[PDB]
Amino acid sequence: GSDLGKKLLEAARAGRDDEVRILMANGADVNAADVVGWTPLHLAAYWGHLEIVEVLLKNGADVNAYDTLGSTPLHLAAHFGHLEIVEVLLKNGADVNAKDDNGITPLHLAANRGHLEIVEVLLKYGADVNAQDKFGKTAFDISINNGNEDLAEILQ
Amino acid sequence: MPNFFIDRPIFAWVIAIIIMLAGGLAILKLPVAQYPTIAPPAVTISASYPGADAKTVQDTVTQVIEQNMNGIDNLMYMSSNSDSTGTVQITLTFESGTDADIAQVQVQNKLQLAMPLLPQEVQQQGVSVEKSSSSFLMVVGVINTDGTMTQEDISDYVAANMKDAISRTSGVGDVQLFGSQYAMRIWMNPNELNKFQLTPVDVITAIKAQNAQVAAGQLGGTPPVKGQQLNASIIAQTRLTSTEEFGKILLKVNQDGSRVLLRDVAKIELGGENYDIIAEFNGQPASGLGIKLATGANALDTAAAIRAELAKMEPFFPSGLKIVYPYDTTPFVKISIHEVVKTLVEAIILVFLVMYLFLQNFRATLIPTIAVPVVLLGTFAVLAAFGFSINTLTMFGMVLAIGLLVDDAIVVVENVERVMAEEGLPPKEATRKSMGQIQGALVGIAMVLSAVFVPMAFFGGSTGAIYRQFSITIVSAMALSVLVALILTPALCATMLKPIAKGDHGEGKKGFFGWFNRMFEKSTHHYTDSVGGILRSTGRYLVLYLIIVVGMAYLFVRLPSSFLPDEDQGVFMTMVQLPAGATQERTQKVLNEVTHYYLTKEKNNVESVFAFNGFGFAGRGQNTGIAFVSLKDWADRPGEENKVEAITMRATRAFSQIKDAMVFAFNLPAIVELGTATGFDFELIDQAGLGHEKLTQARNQLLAEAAKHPDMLTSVRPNGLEDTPQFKIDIDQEKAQALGVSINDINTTLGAAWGGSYVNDFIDRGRVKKVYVMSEAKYRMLPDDIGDWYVRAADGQMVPFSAFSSSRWEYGSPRLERYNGLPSMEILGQAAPGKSTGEAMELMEQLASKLPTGVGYDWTGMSYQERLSGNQAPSLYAISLIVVFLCLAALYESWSIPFSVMLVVPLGVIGALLAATFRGLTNDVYFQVGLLTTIGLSAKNAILIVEFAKDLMDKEGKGLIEATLDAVRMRLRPILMTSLAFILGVMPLVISTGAGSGAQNAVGTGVMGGMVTATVLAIFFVPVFFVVVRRRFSRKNEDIEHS
Amino acid sequence: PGADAKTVQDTVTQVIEQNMNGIDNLMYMSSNSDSTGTVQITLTFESGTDADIAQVQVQNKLQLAMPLLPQEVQQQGVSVEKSSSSFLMVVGVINT
Amino acid sequence: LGTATGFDFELIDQAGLGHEKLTQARNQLLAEAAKHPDMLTSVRPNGLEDTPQFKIDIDQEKAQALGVSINDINTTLGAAWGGSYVNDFIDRGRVKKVYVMSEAKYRMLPDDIGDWYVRAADGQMVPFSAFSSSRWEYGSPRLE
Amino acid sequence: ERLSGNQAPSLYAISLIVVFLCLAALYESWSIPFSVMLVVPLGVIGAL
Ligand SMILES: CN(C)c1ccc(O)c2c1C[C@H]1C[C@H]3[C@H](N(C)C)C(O)=C(C(N)=O)C(=O)[C@@]3(O)C(O)=C1C2=O
């Protein structure tokens, strides 16, 4: 990293929109990453800061940045139920089938926590329903392991 | 009583000497300490879970213990933190006055019932229960200047050779080692383990089996066979004692018959029990001891004894081993004793000077020089009687009692010299008459001064603990002063004073004294002339009195209040905080720069920097550190710019440029056992089951609102740490079962390699110590190392961790807080400039009331006490007023005349408020106690004026004005003598700079200001009080003389 | 049971001794560990110490080292007694 | 209170010198003291002197080769020769202990060691003489 | 012994001084107490 990179990261995590905008205006790197490879977009997707996500994307943030274990902001937003952020990310070109180092996709994550509406959005945008993580498991396998009957239906 | 001892001056001397004897004995035997117990008693439970994260610690240890912490007497609140180092501390704080030994025993008994519920690894570390509210007597550091020892070597030497001798020294009560005795460290290599189809499980099993101490019975053991001739012990396996013996533990015998020894899969070395803290003294590896005073011990005795014990070990130290003393409260305590004695010795000299200036003979001068030391010595015996100690507070109690003690001596002696001169009466008979005039009033004064000072002792909490010290000291000195004034000083007046010819006022003396006597006779005439004219139109001065009373109230309301002055204690701290996930090595560079700065740009002021990499006062962690700066003696640091406050601001400014970290310097509190005292201490509490993330959100909400009232609250901030990245690794149960890998082998391999594991004990040079297994560092650093660890399946195949695990980054807490058993987040803060912390606290609660449902709050620490002790000052002093009134009503046999004494109270207060306001000081406890001694003296002056006036009317028939004028003429000289001696005696305290000057300034300037206006104003005002009160409450003729 | 002196001392005596600090009014501590499998650790306190307090504080420190003792020693029961009082009487019992 | 006559001296190992060196130092001090009989008399140790003990070494390699576990070995030796508290039983209504120990005649002399067998993983009975050696040495019957 | 040998002379210095003081009050004299205190060896020699 470097100077204004670090202030943007903490700004995106804390949810300080005006300051994100100010640091943008001053030439801060939208794609500045910390030690684990999280960008401001990672941070804002994880903490659910929808407006910061938009502002970062409007300013050319890599929508498909991956951390050191291969996870993208879409993974985070889908895993922790941030539906509106999942739509914004997909609208801006987020790889709906991105896999982390474990073969895990946003659909696996959304399915594992039961976020039915996120699962439908991801499917609408072309999520491979038969995608398998490193253990051979699909979102369907996840659904029936969780006993989530509604999800199990939707995932054919 | 005075008549009895006038006729027996040797019996009087004998009582004085026995009093002095009892006091000197007390001084050789009383505990000495900087402060008495002031913090509420706290008990701390500490436990350790090696390799555990904060949430694991809290949910397997903290909550289990907390749920058993009920049914404990006098508990005020409980708080805990559980952190990423595997450590939990639960602090239970008890009401002031709780027996801390009982509180500890009850906590221990509740804890011991939850012990079987704790993980075995936590039980094996030892769960300690300690009294944690006492503070360090001294911190000993230990270095090796030869450069030949790591901190682990130094800690082992301290643990094995020094720690217990210290613990055994006279007056020591607790001892904390900076580090650990050696542990046997097995550093595993996962490549070599896999090569031989082995895991940490097999290593741990082989150590337990081959590092064992076996009970084997005896040859010829009982019950024996008939005819047995031999009895002998069977000795089987014994604990291993060396790295070599651990290395040849046999793990395995291969197929070809070759041997896999422990040293073929691990490095083996004596090392530390853990490695979270790097300790350095002036940049060299260090260990040390934190030493606490035993309850009721003499601190001066213990420090000397500790230093002697370490001197006697010094010849048997390994070459280079050096003891250092970065912290020791003993020197500061000695300065306090010396400054107080200095103040007493010179107050006696000043009384000599004033006594000679006015009474002009050396015989009269000897009597206060005798009586005052008798009362001070004797006061120690009364303190010994009540269990008190010689401390900063009791000693300043005695310098505050000088004015009252000196006054008793002057009042007795000056009155006999006046009776002799006005009446030509011989010594013995003038003392009998003079004592008859003052004796009843001296006893009423003793009651009245008890009602002034005793209610103080009933304040609650920490402040009451401080006041109680002043209250008991001053009352005991005062009572003893009255006894001595009824026994010894009359007998000394009757036998040492030489007669004065009637009407002789020394006006016919030559030289300076004759000038003085003619000037002071003139002045008394102007004074009584002035009072006469004032008495002609009393209404105008009743309006002036009201102006003074309103001005006092105005000044009082605007004087900022505070707790105890900050002191330059010769030591301060500098905090180091690095970003999330920052490593020990990165924190060490910042501490090195901090250490370099102090030993370079502050070389003249700094003696040492004791830097601790791995803990701070926000919490523990690789990204946190503290440097404790010990300064050269105050003597070698002359100047405002070389005091702690100035050094601290320069350092903080200099460290503003450090980019890797937040680095802040700051002074210690006056009472480090209590801390802060400035500001408030807020607890946000999860009272539904909202969970940590929701609690942080609520906390951030409250913090944002608070920053939007910067006119009310400033610097409101979390006390703890923010969430940090963590590595979340999921074990796939299905794949493990498919491969035939058991979950116990999986979790034990991961835990032992990456967190380390306490296996069992061994014997190192005769002493039992621990064995720990852990991966060598280079195979446990980054996520890619996870896959180099193999676990053996049931079918014997080696399976890499990558086959049955997945992982991801997430956020979680490095330090979880709980308050009274519920998840909590502590918020510090303070009232904005010129605002009351009591009102800042009201805003905090109003903001808090808007937070999401299920979030609640509570106040702790100094703020808890405030909310339970604000209603005290007016009611405790209503009580004091009423009892003073009642005592005065008995003394004068009147319901109205007490008002002419009680109205002098604002006269000293306005000068105290003026002196503190001008000097920019605060209404702190030293100011408050000075107020009561000033009020005490002023009331005593009025009581004797009014007593003389009333007696002149009652037993000599004089009318109101003649009696009032004559009383005021007689009382002028002793009032001025006491006030000149006391004001001078307190001047060194007002201008004091240096060691302890914060306290001395505080007692000095309110007292000096109060003394000035009390005397100047009372000698004109209490005649007005007496005349208007006598005129308003009356019936038949009293303006005119009668028979 | 069945332990030699060195085994007793190095698995029981030292473990307990290392936890015998932070006790009020302790003058000295002594112990012996012998071939019968027995250890006695005697802590002696200043004259005037409340012996009930001294016992309670010793017991509390001991009880923290208990999980470190071999299970066979825990199962025998580790007693903590005031040992400075003397025998009022000794009763013997025989069968004639 | 006891004695009251005389003195009560403690010699203390303050480096890690160990018991044998401490006995030597003690014997040194006792010899000197006996050479001032005008000053000190009857200065003597309060405790006991070192006595022969039977030191038995278990060979870890041979045990592993035979498939005999060390736990079965040490438990067989300890329970038979030292005895072992197993659990509790009820005797006429009152709870009391159960102890297992060898009958006296099989636990008296070194030759008895070899009459004790431990079962290997493969089910064979292995005599203690197969995986152990022993020697006489000196050690303390009472450590202070 | 090593913590209580300095006691007998100082504890009895104290006793001497207080006896003197008590005698001085009884007789209203600093000197007459000596004519009592000097009897102390007279009983001690017979005991010895
Ligand atoms: C604040 N404190 C007393 C210090 C200061 C400097 C230090 O260098 C250290 C400590 C704590 C001590 C506690 C000791 C403890 N014990 C007395 C051996 C201990 O069991 C632990 C533990 N939590 O496992 C340590 O951290 C510890 O080994 C340790 O490494 C310390 C340490 O390194």
Author numbering:
A (entry chain B): 11 to 166
B (entry chain A): 1 to 1043
C (entry chain A): 50 to 145
D (entry chain A): 674 to 817
E (entry chain A): 866 to 913
From the manuscript:
Resistance nodulation and cell division (RND) efflux pumps are secondary active antiporters that are ubiquitous across all domains of life. As part of tripartite multidrug efflux systems in Gram-negative bacteria, they span the entire cell envelope and export a broad variety of structurally and chemically unrelated toxic substrates. During drug efflux, AcrB undergoes a functional rotation where each of the three protomers sequentially cycles through the conformational states loose (L), tight (T) and open (O). Substrates can enter the PD through several channels and bind to the access pocket (AP) in the L state and the deep binding pocket (DBP) in the T state.
To assess this, we solved the co-structures of V612F and V612W in complex with minocycline via X-ray crystallography. The introduced F or W side chain is sandwiched between the reoriented F615 and F610, forming a stack of aromatic rings, and closes off the groove of the DBP, thus reducing its size. Minocycline is shifted in the binding pocket to avoid steric overlap with the introduced F or W at position 612. Compared to the wildtype co-structure, the contact between R620 and minocycline is lost, but appears to be compensated by additional H-bonding interactions via carbonyl oxygen acceptors of Q125 and G179. Further, the flipped F615 is in interaction distance of the aromatic ring of minocycline. The V612 variant co-structures demonstrate the plasticity of the DBP that is able to accommodate the ligand and allows the formation of alternative interactions despite the alterations in the binding network. Corresponding to these results, the resistance against minocycline is only marginally affected by the V612 substitutions. In contrast to wildtype AcrB, that crystallises in the LLL and LTO states, the V612F/W crystal structures were exclusively obtained in the TTT state.
